RNA sequence: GAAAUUGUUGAAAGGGAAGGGCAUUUGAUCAGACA
RNA sequence: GGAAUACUGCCAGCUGGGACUGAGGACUGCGACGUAAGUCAAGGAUGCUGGCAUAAUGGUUAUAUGCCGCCCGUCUUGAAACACGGACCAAGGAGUCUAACGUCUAUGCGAGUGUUUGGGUGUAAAACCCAUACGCGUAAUGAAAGUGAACGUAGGUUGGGGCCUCGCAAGAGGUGCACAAUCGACCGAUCCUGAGGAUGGAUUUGAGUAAGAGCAUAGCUGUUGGGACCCGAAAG
RNA sequence: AAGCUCGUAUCAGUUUUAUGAAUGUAAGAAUGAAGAGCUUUUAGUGGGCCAUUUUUGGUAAGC
């Protein structure tokens, strides 16, 4: 049930040691799944192929 | 007694200095918005010129307005509406979009009309229906010193810094949003458009995601 | 004395339910205690009840139309109390004061400039 | 939480009036506890015996402190020697008044204490045994 | 003592946001932009039709 | 010397109910301010 | 090829018409314009002007008109409904007094407390004084006989409002009230130790001691007994 | 209702992530709230009718 908590606290112990041993912006908190960032997707080989209920 | 005009004049000098800081910040935000939207336009044009497709960056901010009454609501969504501070009908709040918040929206779809706000709507919402939670006590904004006194802890020092933290969903979004008392909107000026309000927006109703027409909707509610 | 315009909220009298039907039921207000009364559950078209929403404006409460608080007075020594407060309070000569003494109080109130609400009381010629 | 005390004593009302002023002004946590204690009932303020004051002066580094009781100070027969300090309370039992004065110290009121310790400095507040009685 | 709305009543609009003077002066909402000639490619046009 | 209940006189209303609430016209009647 | 325009979105763009509202009452604040002085639409209405000065406001009232509006009370049940009471008016008409015990609050005194059984006195059922006892409490435990609560600064550890020292503050430490948990000392009955019942050993009991907290009066009130919230019963 | 603490990090008919054979835990995830705990005691209360969704049985059909 709490199998992840002890492991992530051990990861918090690894990231606290890494925090002290570096000029740090810490971020040990888990952030939820963000909205998707912008990307330019190219259609050079992979052509935008049409479909329809032909059927 | 002294101090009658001396401390007054020094206070006026401090007022002028603080105001000038706000001015150059506002100019910086104005230029930021303008260049941002120009970047979206030009990247779209360049994608078409390359024979490619440009996806936009997915929206990170929604405005949620309650559509239904307090009664005949299941508890599973009734708790959710209290958590989004949608206590009465037509009460509106801003929501940061994550995986955690999007499913909260999916539970309450038949009871709210939400979408993605522009800068113009947020500017008009905060300027007209702007109210702060100062210890409690729904305080009307009207003065920049009122914003700075509470939110100077988080950088924010004027009305437009607060709007900036809302739209450009920032490091201190939670504090600016929770500071803002849930907006109390009137029924829409032109009407709802639809005959029956409680169908999904796609099938000739009001509720659910409308994505962009929330700007048309909330500006009439404002 | 400068006062706001008086808004009463309810000009009418809150008469008791079925006071106009029966003669044994007085017009004096009583709350309908019964659980199946349509008056208690405030139905459409039933009589309006006294509730605290009908409370008069605090700045214009207890004031006569002239912006004066009425003050009952029996004799000269009690009238002499309103020497300083002439535009706040106005004298009211008590019902039981004789016609001999009312002329004394009226003349004295004219001298100090204290307003009497009821002259012509026992002043027949 | 209480606005006005259940007491009808005009002198207790004057002490309440005095400490409402000092509790809201001086912002010292002494006056807030004192003014809280004056709103309590008879069963809620049990008497402090002169024996407990004797203990509080045997206390380490608490010799020349001004002891404050917001109940009543009662006489005791079990003790034989009493120190030389100033005791502040509402009422003193005739015997305890006699004992404090005979030992050499002073027995003062609460307003007298309010002049001497407005911020409640060098003070010590004792309350009596509550759950000891039923 | 009373809530003066911005948007209307330009005086309280200038009380908040001191940039409002500069925004109105330069117009800055009715601001023109320079045009380019980035024509859409053959692939985009053919797949649109 | 109350009310129930009745007579007379004056006003008003009344096509298979009446009394009640909101609002006003109409008729009746009344309060100040101009001391 | 070179344009226009629709639609969509923005303007801290300008300019009209209409409605409802004017709360507050010397000055403070935030601002804007101005070269400055000063002004302002900036912390809620002022300026000008006219009719009347009484039934013209408005109220009360009888009616008309538009719209609304089951007959109250009781008793049932998940509801509605039945059913039962209600010809009309006046006056009368139902949680009262007391005893006993208890909670909370107020007051007096406080390891004490209570005068009012009585006596003295009295301006005379009032008030004002009081000797001797008595009641409850200050000690409990055991079936009774009986015995009877400090080894310690009245005890150690854990928290603990306050207060004290340092701290330009945050904070650290000392002291720790009431009170709460755990390990101990004494009283009581309960067995080995054998000094007969000794010094010491271990718990069980208690509404224990561990530096008292009660007594009395008054008020709100609860339980029980009284005719006991008012009227009614098949009677011996 | 009363007293004593902390007015707080005391939590929530909610989502997420992870652990699991629409329910179970944890969180230095989200979002929401200043009404939290502990004694003491003091009223009233101890029926159900209708409908929606799961699910097991049923039949001319209801159920």
UniProtKB/Swiss-Prot annotation, chain A:
**Which compartment or compartments is the protein found in?**
Cytoplasm
Residue ranges annotated as coiled coil are none
The stretch of residues making up the signal peptide is none
General remark? There are 2 genes for eL21 in yeast.
What does this gene product do? Answer: Component of the ribosome, a large ribonucleoprotein complex responsible for the synthesis of proteins in the cell. The small ribosomal subunit (SSU) binds messenger RNAs (mRNAs) and translates the encoded message by selecting cognate aminoacyl-transfer RNA (tRNA) molecules. The large subunit (LSU) contains the ribosomal catalytic site termed the peptidyl transferase center (PTC), which catalyzes the formation of peptide bonds, thereby polymerizing the amino acids delivered by tRNAs into a polypeptide chain.
Name the family. Belongs to the eukaryotic ribosomal protein eL21 family.
Question: Quaternary state and partners of this protein?
Answer: Component of the large ribosomal subunit (LSU). Mature yeast ribosomes consist of a small (40S) and a large (60S) subunit. The 40S small subunit contains 1 molecule of ribosomal RNA (18S rRNA) and 33 different proteins (encoded by 57 genes). The large 60S subunit contains 3 rRNA molecules (25S, 5.8S and 5S rRNA) and 46 different proteins (encoded by 81 genes).
Q: What is this protein called?
A: Large ribosomal subunit protein eL21A
Species assigned in the record:
Saccharomyces cerevisiae (strain ATCC 204508 / S288c) (Baker's yeast)
The gene for this chain is: RPL21A
Swiss-Prot record, chain B:
Q: Which PROSITE patterns match?
A: RIBOSOMAL_L30
Q: Where is the signal peptide?
A: none
Tell me the keywords, alphabetical order: Cytoplasm, Ribonucleoprotein, Ribosomal protein
* UniProt cross-references to InterPro entries, sorted A to Z: Ribo_uL30_ferredoxin-like_sf, Ribosomal_uL30, Ribosomal_uL30_CS, Ribosomal_uL30_euk, Ribosomal_uL30_euk_arc, Ribosomal_uL30_ferredoxin-like, Ribosomal_uL30_N_euk
Entry's Gene Ontology molecular function annotations: RNA binding; structural constituent of ribosome
Task: List GO BP terms, alphabetically.
Answer: cytoplasmic translation; maturation of LSU-rRNA; maturation of LSU-rRNA from tricistronic rRNA transcript (SSU-rRNA, 5.8S rRNA, LSU-rRNA); ribosomal large subunit biogenesis
Entry's Gene Ontology cellular component terms: cytoplasm; cytosol; cytosolic large ribosomal subunit
Where it mainly occurs, coarsely classed, is cytoplasm
Q: Where in the cell is it found?
A: Cytoplasm
Superkingdom of source: Eukaryota
Q: What else is known?
A: Present with 101000 molecules/cell in log phase SD medium. There are 2 genes for uL30 in yeast.
Which family is it part of?
A: Belongs to the universal ribosomal protein uL30 family.
Assembly and partners are described as: Component of the large ribosomal subunit (LSU). Mature yeast ribosomes consist of a small (40S) and a large (60S) subunit. The 40S small subunit contains 1 molecule of ribosomal RNA (18S rRNA) and 33 different proteins (encoded by 57 genes). The large 60S subunit contains 3 rRNA molecules (25S, 5.8S and 5S rRNA) and 46 different proteins (encoded by 81 genes).
Protein name per the record: Large ribosomal subunit protein uL30A
* Provenance organism: Saccharomyces cerevisiae (strain ATCC 204508 / S288c)
Q: What is the lineage of its organism?
A: Eukaryota, Fungi, Dikarya, Ascomycota, Saccharomycotina
Curated annotation (Swiss-Prot), chain C:
| A GO biological process held by the record | cytoplasmic translation
Q: Which GO terms describe its molecular function?
A: structural constituent of ribosome
Please tell me whether the keyword Ribonucleoprotein is annotated for this protein. yes
Compartment(s) of residence:
Cytoplasm
Modified residue annotations for Phosphoserine: 37
Entry keyword set = Cytoplasm, Phosphoprotein, Ribonucleoprotein, Ribosomal protein
> Any one cellular component term from GO for this entry?
cytosolic large ribosomal subunit
Note the superkingdom of the native organism.
Eukaryota
**Oligomer status and interactors:** Component of the large ribosomal subunit (LSU). Mature yeast ribosomes consist of a small (40S) and a large (60S) subunit. The 40S small subunit contains 1 molecule of ribosomal RNA (18S rRNA) and 33 different proteins (encoded by 57 genes). The large 60S subunit contains 3 rRNA molecules (25S, 5.8S and 5S rRNA) and 46 different proteins (encoded by 81 genes).
The Swiss-Prot or TrEMBL record describes its family as follows: Belongs to the eukaryotic ribosomal protein eL32 family.
Q: What does this protein do?
A: Component of the ribosome, a large ribonucleoprotein complex responsible for the synthesis of proteins in the cell. The small ribosomal subunit (SSU) binds messenger RNAs (mRNAs) and translates the encoded message by selecting cognate aminoacyl-transfer RNA (tRNA) molecules. The large subunit (LSU) contains the ribosomal catalytic site termed the peptidyl transferase center (PTC), which catalyzes the formation of peptide bonds, thereby polymerizing the amino acids delivered by tRNAs into a polypeptide chain.
Which protein, by its recorded name, is this? Large ribosomal subunit protein eL32
Specify the species. Saccharomyces cerevisiae (strain ATCC 204508 / S288c)
UniProtKB/Swiss-Prot annotation, chain D:
Query: At what sequence positions does the UniProt record place the cross-link Glycyl lysine isopeptide (Lys-Gly) (interchain with G-Cter in ubiquitin)?
Result: 102
Q: Mainly localized where?
A: cytoplasm
* Keyword Transcription regulation applies: no
One BP term from GO: cytoplasmic translation
Keywords in alphabetical order, please. Answer: Cytoplasm, Isopeptide bond, Methylation, Ribonucleoprotein, Ribosomal protein, Ubl conjugation
Q: Where can this protein be found? A: Cytoplasm
One GO cellular component term: cytosolic large ribosomal subunit
Residue numbers carrying N6,N6,N6-trimethyllysine = 36
Q: Which GO terms describe its molecular function?
A: RNA binding; structural constituent of ribosome
Q: Quaternary form? A: Component of the large ribosomal subunit (LSU). Mature yeast ribosomes consist of a small (40S) and a large (60S) subunit. The 40S small subunit contains 1 molecule of ribosomal RNA (18S rRNA) and 33 different proteins (encoded by 57 genes). The large 60S subunit contains 3 rRNA molecules (25S, 5.8S and 5S rRNA) and 46 different proteins (encoded by 81 genes). eL18 interacts with NAP1.
Family assignment from sequence similarity: Belongs to the eukaryotic ribosomal protein eL18 family.
Q: What else is known?
A: There are 2 genes for eL18 in yeast.
User: Its function?
Assistant: Component of the ribosome, a large ribonucleoprotein complex responsible for the synthesis of proteins in the cell. The small ribosomal subunit (SSU) binds messenger RNAs (mRNAs) and translates the encoded message by selecting cognate aminoacyl-transfer RNA (tRNA) molecules. The large subunit (LSU) contains the ribosomal catalytic site termed the peptidyl transferase center (PTC), which catalyzes the formation of peptide bonds, thereby polymerizing the amino acids delivered by tRNAs into a polypeptide chain.
């Amino acid at each position: 049930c709490r199998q992840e908590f002890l492991e992530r606290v051990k990861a918090n112990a690894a990231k606290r040691a890494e925090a002290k041993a570096q000029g740090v912006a810490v971020q040990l908190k888990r952030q939820p799944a963000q909205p998707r960032e912008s990307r330019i997707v190219s259609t050079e080989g992979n052509v935008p192929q049409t479909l329809a209920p032909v059927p | 007694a002294e101090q009658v005009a001396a401390e007054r004049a020094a206070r006026k000098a401090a007022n002028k200095e603080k105001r000038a800081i706000i001015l150059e910040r506002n100019a910086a935000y104005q230029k930021e918005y303008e260049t941002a939207e120009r970047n979206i336009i030009q990247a779209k044009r360049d994608a078409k010129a390359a024979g490619s497709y440009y996806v936009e960056a997915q929206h990170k901010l929604v405005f949620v307005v309650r559509i239904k009454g307090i009664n005949k609501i299941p508890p599973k969504p009734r708790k959710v509406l209290q958590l989004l501070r949608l206590t009465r009908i037509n009460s509106g709040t801003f929501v940061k979009v994550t995986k955690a918040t999007l499913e909260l929206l999916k539970l309450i779809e038949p009871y709210v009309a939400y979408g993605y706000p522009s800068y113009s709507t947020i500017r008009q919402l905060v300027y007209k229906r702007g109210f702060g939670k100062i210890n409690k006590q729904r305080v009307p904004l009207s003065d920049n010193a009122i914003i700075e006194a509470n939110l100077g802890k988080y950088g924010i020092l004027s009305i437009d810094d607060l709007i900036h933290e809302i739209i450009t969903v920032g490091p201190h979004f939670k504090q600016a949003n929770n500071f803002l008392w849930p907006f109390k909107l009137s029924n829409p000026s032109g009407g709802w458009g639809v005959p029956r309000k409680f169908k999904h927006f796609i099938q000739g109703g009001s509720f659910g995601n409308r994505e962009e027409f929330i700007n048309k909707l909330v500006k009439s509610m404002n | 004395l400068p006062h706001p315009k008086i808004v009463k909220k309810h000009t009418k009298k809150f008469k008791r339910h079925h006071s106009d039907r029966y003669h044994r039921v007085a017009e004096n207000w009583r709350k309908q205690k019964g659980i199946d009364s349509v008056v208690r559950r405030r139905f459409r078209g039933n009589i309006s009840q006294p509730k605290i929403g009908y409370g008069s404006n605090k700045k214009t409460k207890f004031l006569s139309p002239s912006g004066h608080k009425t003050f009952l007075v029996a004799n000269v020594k009690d009238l002499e109390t309103l020497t300083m407060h002439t535009k706040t309070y106005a004298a009211e000569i008590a019902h039981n004061i004789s016609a001999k003494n009312r002329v004394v109080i009226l003349a004295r109130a004219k001298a100090l400039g204290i307003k009497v609400t009821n002259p012509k009381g026992r002043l027949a010629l | 939480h209480r606005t006005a005390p259940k007491s009808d004593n005009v002198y207790l009302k004057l002490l309440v009036k005095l400490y409402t002023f000092l509790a809201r002004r001086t912002d010292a946590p002494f006056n807030k506890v004192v003014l809280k204690a004056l709103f309590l009932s008879k069963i809620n303020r049990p008497p402090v015996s002169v024996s407990r004051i004797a203990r509080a002066l045997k206390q380490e580094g608490a010799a020349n402190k001004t002891v404050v009781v917001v109940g009543t100070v009662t006489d005791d027969a079990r003790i034989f020697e009493f120190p030389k300090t100033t005791v502040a309370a509402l009422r003193f039992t005739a015997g305890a008044r006699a004992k404090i004065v005979k030992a050499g110290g002073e027995c003062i009121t609460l307003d007298q204490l309010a002049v001497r310790a407005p911020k409640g400095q060098n003070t010590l507040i004792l309350r009596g045994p509550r759950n000891s009685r039923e | 003592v009373l809530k003066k709305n911005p948007l209307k009543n330009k005086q309280v609009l200038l009380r908040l946001n001191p940039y409002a003077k500069v925004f109105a002066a330069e117009k800055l909402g009715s601001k023109k932009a320079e045009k380019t000639g980035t024509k859409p490619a053959a692939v985009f046009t053919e797949t649109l039709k």
